[PDB]
């Protein structure tokens, strides 16, 4: 199995090469946002990103080895978390703003355009702030996003395969940190800080799904 | 007007910086094309590109100096020529095919999916092959696309004419800098502008086809 034979550097390359395109938004820029139009805009973007997410997932080492049933299950569970971590990443260097697209940059006040959305915006903004303050690297980001794909549905022998893949991504994170010059103590501390991010991403996805269902 | 004070290097730099994003397509890749679905995909793509064309046009030196009425007219007349020159550009590395999007590469036989479209495909493919044979540069491409916008449709010189003269200067500058002799520069300028006649032709046939299927 190719996935378990990859060195850490090969894993990073494969994850970097798998990245989906950065999508642009379309809208009338002479027309003010409404609740319906903003929610319509974000829905449109997410639906398009979902199409490209499929092509990315198939390039994640190990994913295509799984059965169709398992692939569907993992994607069905993780997709909003995957959208949100991507959103947080691209917003990292824009304090106070969410960079949905290069031509769609929104602040928290604009989040108030949709009832109940500002609470979610605030969580996403705090996570992006955390990323910035940790100086999260793109190589770390791609590892985390693939961990979400493989982990979020992983309880709900082929499951042992996913766990060996997940262990390899952990080896990959530590490799990146050791190469960066972190001490052994700093490596385990930063590994923990990064994986704890994923509990907050799960929380935001759950709150997002709840909001989507209520409307 | 500031546009007329631009050096050739500044014109090139402004036109490169105005470029719109390369758009991807979305489709179910496990479902085969139909006439309806292929035309549907190309229509969806074009309509997205039109949105980004507006932002591009506003960044073309001289364009925002025009009245709203003139801006609308140039775009209404030129938009399909502009889509087509872009398509022909991104298809150069794919002989026999048209790269509509990085994930949507269609060969000539796929053009037959849509009644009448294969005649247009063949013209587009020949144009792309001509640009390849000429080794068209990206800097030259952006000059030609802005020429199309400004030359769109049908006292000595109005503003558009003066801006078009500056883009000609810029094309010649690019050729000179690449080491072409003066004779070669004028010959290549002519060859490029003659291809714009063919792009106009292809746009007219396309608009015909679109109006007749509506």
């Amino acid at each position: 199995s190719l996935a378990l034979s990859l060195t850490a550097d090969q894993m990073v390359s494969a994850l970097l090469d798998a990245e989906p395109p950065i999508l642009y938004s379309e809208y009338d820029p002479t027309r003010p946002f409404s609740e319906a139009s903003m929610m319509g805009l974000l829905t449109n973007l997410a639906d398009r990103e979902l199409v490209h997410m499929i092509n990315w997932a198939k390039r994640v080492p190990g994913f295509v080895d799984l059965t169709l049933h398992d692939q569907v299950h993992l994607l069905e569970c993780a997709w909003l978390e995957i959208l949100m971590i991507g959103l947080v990443w691209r917003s990292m260097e824009h304090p106070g703003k969410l960079l949905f697209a290069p031509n769609l940059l929104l602040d928290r006040n604009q989040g108030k355009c949709v009832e109940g959305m500002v609470e979610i915006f605030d969580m996403l903004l705090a996570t992006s702030s955390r990323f910035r303050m940790m100086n999260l690297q793109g190589e770390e980001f791609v590892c985390l996003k693939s961990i979400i794909l493989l982990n979020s549905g992983v309880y709900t022998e082929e499951k042992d395969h996913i766990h060996r893949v997940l262990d390899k991504i952990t080896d990959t994170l530590i490799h990146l940190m050791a190469k960066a010059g972190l001490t052994l103590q700093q490596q385990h501390q930063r590994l923990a800080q990064l994986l704890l991010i994923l509990s907050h991403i799960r929380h935001m996805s759950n709150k997002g799904m709840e909001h989507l269902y209520s409307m | 007007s500031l546009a007329l004070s631009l050096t050739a290097d500044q014109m090139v730099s402004a036109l490169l910086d105005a470029e719109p994003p390369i758009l991807y397509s979305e489709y179910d890749p496990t479902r085969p094309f139909s006439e309806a679905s292929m035309m549907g995909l190309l229509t969806n793509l074009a309509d997205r590109e039109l949105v980004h064309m507006i932002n591009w046009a506003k960044r073309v030196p001289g364009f925002v100096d025009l009245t709203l009425h003139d801006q609308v007219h140039l775009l209404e007349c030129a938009w399909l020529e502009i889509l087509m020159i872009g398509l022909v550009w991104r298809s150069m590395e794919h002989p026999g095919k048209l790269l509509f999007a990085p994930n949507l590469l269609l060969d000539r036989n796929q053009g037959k999916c849509v009644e009448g479209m294969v005649e247009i495909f063949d013209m587009l493919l020949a144009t792309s092959s001509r640009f390849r044979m000429m080794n068209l540069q990206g800097e030259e491409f952006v000059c030609l696309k802005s020429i199309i916008l400004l030359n769109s449709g049908v006292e000595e010189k109005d503003h558009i004419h003066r801006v078009l003269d500056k883009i000609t200067d810029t094309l010649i500058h690019l050729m000179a800098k690449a080491g072409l002799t003066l004779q070669q520069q004028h010959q290549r300028l002519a060859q490029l502008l003659l291809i714009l006649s063919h792009i106009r032709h292809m746009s007219n046939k396309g608009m015909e086809h679109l109006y007749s299927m509506k």
Partner: peptide
């Protein structure tokens, strides 16, 4: 709709 089980299944096979 995009993101549903059936959509993923359709898109993946």
């Amino acid at each position: 709709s995009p993101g549903s089980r059936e959509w993923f299944k359709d898109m993946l096979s």
